[PDB]
PDB file of C-alpha atoms in Angstrom:
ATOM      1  CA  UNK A  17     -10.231  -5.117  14.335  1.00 47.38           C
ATOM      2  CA  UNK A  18     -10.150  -1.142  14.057  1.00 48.31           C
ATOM      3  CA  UNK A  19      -8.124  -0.134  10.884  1.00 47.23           C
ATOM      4  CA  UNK A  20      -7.102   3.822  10.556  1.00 48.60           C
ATOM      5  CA  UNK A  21      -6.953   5.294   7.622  1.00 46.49           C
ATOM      6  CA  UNK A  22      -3.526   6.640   6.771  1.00 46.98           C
ATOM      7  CA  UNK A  23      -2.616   3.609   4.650  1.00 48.82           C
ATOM      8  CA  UNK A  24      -4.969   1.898   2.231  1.00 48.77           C
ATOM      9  CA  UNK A  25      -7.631  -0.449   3.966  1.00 50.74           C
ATOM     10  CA  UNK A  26      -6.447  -3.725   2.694  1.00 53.18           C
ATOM     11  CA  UNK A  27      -7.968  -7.237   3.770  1.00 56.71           C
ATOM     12  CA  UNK A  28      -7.241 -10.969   2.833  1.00 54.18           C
ATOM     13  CA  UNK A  29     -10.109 -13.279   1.233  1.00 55.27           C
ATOM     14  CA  UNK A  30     -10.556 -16.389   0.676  1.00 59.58           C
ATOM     15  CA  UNK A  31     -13.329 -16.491  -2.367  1.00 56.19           C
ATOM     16  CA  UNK A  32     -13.538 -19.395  -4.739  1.00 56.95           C
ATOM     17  CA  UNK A  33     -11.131 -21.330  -3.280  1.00 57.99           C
ATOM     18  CA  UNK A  34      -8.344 -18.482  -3.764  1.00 59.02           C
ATOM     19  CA  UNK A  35      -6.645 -16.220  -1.571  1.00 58.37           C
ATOM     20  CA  UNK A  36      -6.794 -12.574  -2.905  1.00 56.67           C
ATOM     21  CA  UNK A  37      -6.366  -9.122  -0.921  1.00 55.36           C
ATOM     22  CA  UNK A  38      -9.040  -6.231  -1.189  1.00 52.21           C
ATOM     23  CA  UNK A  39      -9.286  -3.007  -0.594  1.00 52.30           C
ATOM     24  CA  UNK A  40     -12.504  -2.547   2.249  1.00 54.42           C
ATOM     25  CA  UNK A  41     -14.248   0.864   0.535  1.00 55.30           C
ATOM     26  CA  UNK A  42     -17.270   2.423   2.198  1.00 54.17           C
ATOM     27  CA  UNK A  43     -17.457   3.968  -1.565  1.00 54.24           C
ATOM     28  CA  UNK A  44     -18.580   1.254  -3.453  1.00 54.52           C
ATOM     29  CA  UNK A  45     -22.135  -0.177  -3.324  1.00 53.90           C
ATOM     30  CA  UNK A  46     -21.004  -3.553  -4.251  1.00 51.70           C
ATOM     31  CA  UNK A  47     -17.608  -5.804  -4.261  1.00 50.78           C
ATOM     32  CA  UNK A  48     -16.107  -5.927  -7.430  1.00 50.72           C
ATOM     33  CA  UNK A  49     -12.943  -8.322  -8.087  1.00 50.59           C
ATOM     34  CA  UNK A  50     -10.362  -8.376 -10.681  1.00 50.05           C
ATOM     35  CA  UNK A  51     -10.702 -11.198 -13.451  1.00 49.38           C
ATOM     36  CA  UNK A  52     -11.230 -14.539 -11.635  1.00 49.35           C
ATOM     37  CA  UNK A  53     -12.366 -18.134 -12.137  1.00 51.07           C
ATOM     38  CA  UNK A  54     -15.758 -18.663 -10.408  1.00 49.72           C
ATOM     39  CA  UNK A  55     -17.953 -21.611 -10.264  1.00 48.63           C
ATOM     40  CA  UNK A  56     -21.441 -21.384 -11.799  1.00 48.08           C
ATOM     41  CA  UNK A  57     -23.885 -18.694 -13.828  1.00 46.23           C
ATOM     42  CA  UNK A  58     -23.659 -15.300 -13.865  1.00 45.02           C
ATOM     43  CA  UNK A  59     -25.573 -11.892 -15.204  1.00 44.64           C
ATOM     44  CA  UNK A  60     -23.574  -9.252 -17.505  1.00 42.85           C
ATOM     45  CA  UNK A  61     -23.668  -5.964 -15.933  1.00 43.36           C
ATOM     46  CA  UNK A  62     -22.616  -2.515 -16.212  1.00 43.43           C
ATOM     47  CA  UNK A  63     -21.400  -0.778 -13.403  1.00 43.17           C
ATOM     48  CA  UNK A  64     -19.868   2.918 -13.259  1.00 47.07           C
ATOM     49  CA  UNK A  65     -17.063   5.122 -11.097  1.00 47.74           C
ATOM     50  CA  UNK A  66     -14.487   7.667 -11.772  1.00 47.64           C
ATOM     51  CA  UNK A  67     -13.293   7.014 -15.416  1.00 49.61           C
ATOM     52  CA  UNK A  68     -16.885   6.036 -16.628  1.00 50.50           C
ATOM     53  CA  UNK A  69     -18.150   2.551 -16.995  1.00 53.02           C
ATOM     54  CA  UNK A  70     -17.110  -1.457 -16.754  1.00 53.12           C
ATOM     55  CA  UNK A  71     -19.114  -4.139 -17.817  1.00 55.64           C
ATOM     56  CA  UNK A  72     -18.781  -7.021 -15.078  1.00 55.02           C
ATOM     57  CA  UNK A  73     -20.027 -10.145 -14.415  1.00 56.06           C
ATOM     58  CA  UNK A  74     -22.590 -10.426 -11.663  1.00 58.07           C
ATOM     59  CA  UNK A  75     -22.353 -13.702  -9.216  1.00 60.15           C
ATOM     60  CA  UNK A  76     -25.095 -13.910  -6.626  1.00 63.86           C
ATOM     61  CA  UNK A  77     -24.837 -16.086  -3.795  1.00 60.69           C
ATOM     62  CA  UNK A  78     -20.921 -16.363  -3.833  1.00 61.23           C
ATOM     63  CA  UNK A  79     -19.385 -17.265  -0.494  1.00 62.58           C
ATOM     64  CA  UNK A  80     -16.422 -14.603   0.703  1.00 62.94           C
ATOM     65  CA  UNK A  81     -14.681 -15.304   3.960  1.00 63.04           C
ATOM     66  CA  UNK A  82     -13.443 -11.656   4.749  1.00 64.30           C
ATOM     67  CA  UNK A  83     -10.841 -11.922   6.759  1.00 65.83           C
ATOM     68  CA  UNK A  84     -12.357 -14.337   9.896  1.00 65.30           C
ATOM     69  CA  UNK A  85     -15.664 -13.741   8.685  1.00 64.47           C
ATOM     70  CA  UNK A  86     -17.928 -15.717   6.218  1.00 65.34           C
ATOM     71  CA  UNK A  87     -20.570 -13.447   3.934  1.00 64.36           C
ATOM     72  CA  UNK A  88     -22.829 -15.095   1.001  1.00 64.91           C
ATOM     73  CA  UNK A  89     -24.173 -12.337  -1.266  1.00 64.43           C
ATOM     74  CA  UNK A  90     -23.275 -10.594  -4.754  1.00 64.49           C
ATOM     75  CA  UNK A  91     -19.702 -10.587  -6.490  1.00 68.07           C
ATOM     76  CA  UNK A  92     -19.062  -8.525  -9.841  1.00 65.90           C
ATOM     77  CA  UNK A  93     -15.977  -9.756 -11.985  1.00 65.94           C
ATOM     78  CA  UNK A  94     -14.793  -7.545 -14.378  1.00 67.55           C
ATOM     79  CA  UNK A  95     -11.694  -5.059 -15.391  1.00 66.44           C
ATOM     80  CA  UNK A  96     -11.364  -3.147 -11.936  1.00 68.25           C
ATOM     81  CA  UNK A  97      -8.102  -1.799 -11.322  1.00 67.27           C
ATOM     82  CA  UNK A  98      -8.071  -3.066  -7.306  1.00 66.92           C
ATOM     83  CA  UNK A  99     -10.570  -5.674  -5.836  1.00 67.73           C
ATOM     84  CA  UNK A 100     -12.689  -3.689  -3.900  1.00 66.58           C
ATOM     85  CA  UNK A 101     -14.909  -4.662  -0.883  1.00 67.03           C
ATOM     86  CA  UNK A 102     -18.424  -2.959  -1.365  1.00 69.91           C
ATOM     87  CA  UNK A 103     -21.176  -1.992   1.256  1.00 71.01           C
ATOM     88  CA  UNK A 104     -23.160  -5.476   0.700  1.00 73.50           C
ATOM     89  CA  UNK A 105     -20.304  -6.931   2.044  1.00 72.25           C
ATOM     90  CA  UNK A 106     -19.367  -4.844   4.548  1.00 73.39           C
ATOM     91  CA  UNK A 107     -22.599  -4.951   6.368  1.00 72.64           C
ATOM     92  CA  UNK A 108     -22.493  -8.530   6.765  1.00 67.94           C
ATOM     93  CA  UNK A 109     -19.077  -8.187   8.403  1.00 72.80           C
ATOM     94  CA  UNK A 110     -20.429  -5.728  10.608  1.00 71.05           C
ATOM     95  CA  UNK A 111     -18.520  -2.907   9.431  1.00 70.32           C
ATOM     96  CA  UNK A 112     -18.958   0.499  11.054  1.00 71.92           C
ATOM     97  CA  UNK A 113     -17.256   3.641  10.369  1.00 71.62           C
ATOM     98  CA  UNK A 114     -16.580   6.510  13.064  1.00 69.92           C
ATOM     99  CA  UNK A 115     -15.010   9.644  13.458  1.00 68.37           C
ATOM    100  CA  UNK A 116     -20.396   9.586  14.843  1.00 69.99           C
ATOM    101  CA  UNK A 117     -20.522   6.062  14.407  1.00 67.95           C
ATOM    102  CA  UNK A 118     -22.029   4.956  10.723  1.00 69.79           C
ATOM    103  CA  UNK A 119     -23.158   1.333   9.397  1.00 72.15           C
ATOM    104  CA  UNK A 120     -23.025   1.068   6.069  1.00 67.25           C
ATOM    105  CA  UNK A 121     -26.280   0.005   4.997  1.00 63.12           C
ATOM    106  CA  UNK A 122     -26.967   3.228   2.787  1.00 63.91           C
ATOM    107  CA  UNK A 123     -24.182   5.502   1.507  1.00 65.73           C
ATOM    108  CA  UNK A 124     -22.336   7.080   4.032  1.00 64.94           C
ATOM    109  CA  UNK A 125     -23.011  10.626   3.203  1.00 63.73           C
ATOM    110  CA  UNK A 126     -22.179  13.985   4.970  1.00 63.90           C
ATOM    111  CA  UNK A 127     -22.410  17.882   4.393  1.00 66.68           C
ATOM    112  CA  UNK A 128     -19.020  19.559   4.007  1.00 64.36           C
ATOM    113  CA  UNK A 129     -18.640  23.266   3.785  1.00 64.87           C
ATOM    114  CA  UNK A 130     -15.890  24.112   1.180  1.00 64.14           C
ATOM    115  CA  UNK A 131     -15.274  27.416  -0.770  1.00 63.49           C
ATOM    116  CA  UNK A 132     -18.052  28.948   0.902  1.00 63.23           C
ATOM    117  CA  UNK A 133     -20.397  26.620  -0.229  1.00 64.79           C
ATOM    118  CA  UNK A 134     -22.201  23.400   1.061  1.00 65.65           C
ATOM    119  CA  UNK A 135     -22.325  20.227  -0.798  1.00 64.97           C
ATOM    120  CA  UNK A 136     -23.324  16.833   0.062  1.00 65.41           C
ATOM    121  CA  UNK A 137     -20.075  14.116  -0.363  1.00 67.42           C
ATOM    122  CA  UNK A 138     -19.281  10.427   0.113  1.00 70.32           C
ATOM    123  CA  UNK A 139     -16.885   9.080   3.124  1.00 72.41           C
ATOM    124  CA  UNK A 140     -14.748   6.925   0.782  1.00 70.65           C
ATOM    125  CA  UNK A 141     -12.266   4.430   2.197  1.00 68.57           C
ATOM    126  CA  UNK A 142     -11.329   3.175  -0.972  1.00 67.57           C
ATOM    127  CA  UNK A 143     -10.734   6.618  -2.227  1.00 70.52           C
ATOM    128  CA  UNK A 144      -6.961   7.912  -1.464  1.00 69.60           C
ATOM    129  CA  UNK A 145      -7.705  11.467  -2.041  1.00 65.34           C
ATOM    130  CA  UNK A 146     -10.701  14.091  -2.273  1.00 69.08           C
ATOM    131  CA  UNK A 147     -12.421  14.295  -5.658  1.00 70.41           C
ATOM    132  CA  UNK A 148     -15.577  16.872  -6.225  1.00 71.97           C
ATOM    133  CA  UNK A 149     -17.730  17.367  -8.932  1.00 75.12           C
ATOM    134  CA  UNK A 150     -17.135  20.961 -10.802  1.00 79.35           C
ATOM    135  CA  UNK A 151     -17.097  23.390  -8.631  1.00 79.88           C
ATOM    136  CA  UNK A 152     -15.688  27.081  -8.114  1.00 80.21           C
ATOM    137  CA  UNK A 153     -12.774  26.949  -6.084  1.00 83.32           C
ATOM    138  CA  UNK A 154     -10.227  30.122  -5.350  1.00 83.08           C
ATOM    139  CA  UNK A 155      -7.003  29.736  -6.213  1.00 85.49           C
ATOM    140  CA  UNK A 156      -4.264  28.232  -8.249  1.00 84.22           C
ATOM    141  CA  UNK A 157      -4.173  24.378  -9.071  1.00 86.31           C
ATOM    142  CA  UNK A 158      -2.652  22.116 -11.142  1.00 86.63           C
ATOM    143  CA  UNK A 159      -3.469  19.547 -13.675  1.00 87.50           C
ATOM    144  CA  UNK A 160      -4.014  15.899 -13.328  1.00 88.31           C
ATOM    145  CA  UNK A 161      -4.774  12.799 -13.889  1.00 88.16           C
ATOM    146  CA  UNK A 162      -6.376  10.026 -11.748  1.00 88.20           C
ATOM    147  CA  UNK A 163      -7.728   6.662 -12.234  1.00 89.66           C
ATOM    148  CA  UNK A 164     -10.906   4.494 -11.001  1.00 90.80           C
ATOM    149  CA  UNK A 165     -12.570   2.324 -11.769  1.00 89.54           C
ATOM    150  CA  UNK A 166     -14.055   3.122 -15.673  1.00 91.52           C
ATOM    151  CA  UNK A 167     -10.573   4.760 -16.276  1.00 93.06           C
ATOM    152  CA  UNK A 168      -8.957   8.141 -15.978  1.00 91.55           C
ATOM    153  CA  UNK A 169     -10.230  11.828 -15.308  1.00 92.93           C
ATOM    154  CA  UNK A 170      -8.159  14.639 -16.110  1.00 90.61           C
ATOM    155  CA  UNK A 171      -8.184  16.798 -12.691  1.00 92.03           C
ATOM    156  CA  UNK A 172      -7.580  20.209 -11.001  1.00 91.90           C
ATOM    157  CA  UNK A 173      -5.369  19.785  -8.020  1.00 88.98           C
ATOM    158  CA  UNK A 174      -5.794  21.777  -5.571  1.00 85.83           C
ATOM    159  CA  UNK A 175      -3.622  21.738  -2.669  1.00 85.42           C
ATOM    160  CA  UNK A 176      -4.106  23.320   1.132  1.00 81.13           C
ATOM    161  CA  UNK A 177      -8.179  23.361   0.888  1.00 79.89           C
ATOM    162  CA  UNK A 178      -9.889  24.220   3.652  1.00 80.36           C
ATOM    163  CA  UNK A 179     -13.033  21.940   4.075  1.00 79.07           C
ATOM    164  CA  UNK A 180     -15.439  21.678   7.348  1.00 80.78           C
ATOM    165  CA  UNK A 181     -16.552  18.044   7.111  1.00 79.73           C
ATOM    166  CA  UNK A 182     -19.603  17.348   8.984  1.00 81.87           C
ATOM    167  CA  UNK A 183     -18.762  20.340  11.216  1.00 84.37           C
ATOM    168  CA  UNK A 184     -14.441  18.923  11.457  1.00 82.92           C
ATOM    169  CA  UNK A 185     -11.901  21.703   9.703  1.00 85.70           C
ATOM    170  CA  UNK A 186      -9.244  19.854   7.464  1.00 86.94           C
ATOM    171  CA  UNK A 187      -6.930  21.327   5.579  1.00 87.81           C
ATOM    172  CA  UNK A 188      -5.567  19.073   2.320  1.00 86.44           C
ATOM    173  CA  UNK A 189      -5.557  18.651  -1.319  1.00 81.33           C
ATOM    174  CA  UNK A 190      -8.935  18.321  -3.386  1.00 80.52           C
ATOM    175  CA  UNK A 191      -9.307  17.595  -6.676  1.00 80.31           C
ATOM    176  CA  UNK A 192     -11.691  18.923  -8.616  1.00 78.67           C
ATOM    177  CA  UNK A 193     -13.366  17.072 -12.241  1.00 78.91           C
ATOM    178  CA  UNK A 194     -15.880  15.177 -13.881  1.00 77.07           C
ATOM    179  CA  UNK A 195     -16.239  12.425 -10.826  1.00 74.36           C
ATOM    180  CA  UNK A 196     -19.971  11.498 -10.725  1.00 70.75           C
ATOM    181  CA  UNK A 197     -20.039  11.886  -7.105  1.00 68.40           C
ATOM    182  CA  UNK A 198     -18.340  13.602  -4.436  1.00 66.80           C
ATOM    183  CA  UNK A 199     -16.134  11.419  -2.489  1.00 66.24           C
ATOM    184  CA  UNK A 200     -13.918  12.419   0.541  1.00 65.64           C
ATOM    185  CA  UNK A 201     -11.098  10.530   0.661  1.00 63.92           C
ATOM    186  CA  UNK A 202      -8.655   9.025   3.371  1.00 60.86           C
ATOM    187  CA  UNK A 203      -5.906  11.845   3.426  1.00 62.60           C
ATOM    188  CA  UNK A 204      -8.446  13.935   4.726  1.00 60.94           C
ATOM    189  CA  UNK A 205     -10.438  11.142   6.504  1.00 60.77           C
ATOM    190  CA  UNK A 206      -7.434  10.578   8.560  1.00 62.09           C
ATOM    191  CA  UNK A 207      -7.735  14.229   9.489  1.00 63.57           C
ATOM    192  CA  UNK A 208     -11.071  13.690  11.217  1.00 65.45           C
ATOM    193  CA  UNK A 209      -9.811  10.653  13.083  1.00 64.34           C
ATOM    194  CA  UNK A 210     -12.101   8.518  10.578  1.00 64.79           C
ATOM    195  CA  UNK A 211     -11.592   4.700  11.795  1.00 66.63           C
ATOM    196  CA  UNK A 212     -12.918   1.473  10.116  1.00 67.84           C
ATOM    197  CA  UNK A 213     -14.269  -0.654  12.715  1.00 66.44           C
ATOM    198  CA  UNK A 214     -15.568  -4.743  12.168  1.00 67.81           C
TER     199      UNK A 214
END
């Protein structure tokens, strides 16, 4: 199917013998799922986002059926706030994502043009709004809060933005903190006609 982006991408799968829903994000490297009982060993691991750190525990080899399609490959368990589909899944599903068409083998990365100045940023599906890294922006904001996956970051909201993304003008809200990478999220993906095709 082809999935927009105006609401969150959600998908059902069937991992483990349960039936769970996750969120398909072209931001994470890997699929991470809320606390779950899964057969057989597993690694400890640490893995980081907005908010800071999680330790997980790494399954490789896990079967996911996403929805009609069957992928073997690495699960983390661990105190994430949504279960999130990674890239290592994604490519097995053969997910693209176009606005350009993009696998997802590597990060999906692309120059955006934004106060005057160019920065490199993330095309984030499981990201509902724009976070960069500090940055001098003009203009008022306000304060916030947002969460990921190692927690919260306190953020500077800052609404009407204008940002070229890979050579598209949007205009929305980006928030501005300590994320450790620049993500674009969907309520200005939607603005570039970004689709999520597998």
């Amino acid at each position: 199917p082809q999935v927009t982006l105006w609401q969150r991408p959600l998908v059902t799968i069937k991992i483990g013998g349960q039936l769970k829903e996750a969120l398909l994000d072209t931001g994470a490297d890997d699929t991470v799922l809320e606390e779950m009982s899964l057969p057989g060993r597993w690694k400890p691991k640490m893995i980081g986002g907005i908010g800071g750190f999680i330790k997980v525990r790494q399954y490789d080899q896990i079967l996911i059926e996403i929805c009609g399609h069957k992928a073997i490959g690495t699960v983390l368990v661990g105190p994430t706030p949504v279960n999130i589909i990674g890239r290592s899944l994604l490519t097995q599903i053969g997910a693209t994502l176009n606005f350009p068409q993009v696998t997802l083998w590597q990060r999906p990365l692309v120059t955006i043009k934004i106060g005057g100045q160019l920065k490199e940023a993330l095309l984030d599906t499981g990201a509902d709004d724009t976070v960069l890294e500090e940055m001098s922006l003009p203009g008022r904001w306000k304060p916030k809060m947002i969460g990921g996956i190692g927690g919260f970051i306190k953020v500077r909201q800052y609404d009407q933005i204008l940002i070229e993304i890979c050579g598209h003008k949007a205009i929305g809200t980006v928030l501005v903190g300590p994320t450790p990478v620049n993500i674009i999220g969907r309520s200005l993906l939607t603005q570039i006609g970004a689709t999520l095709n597998f």
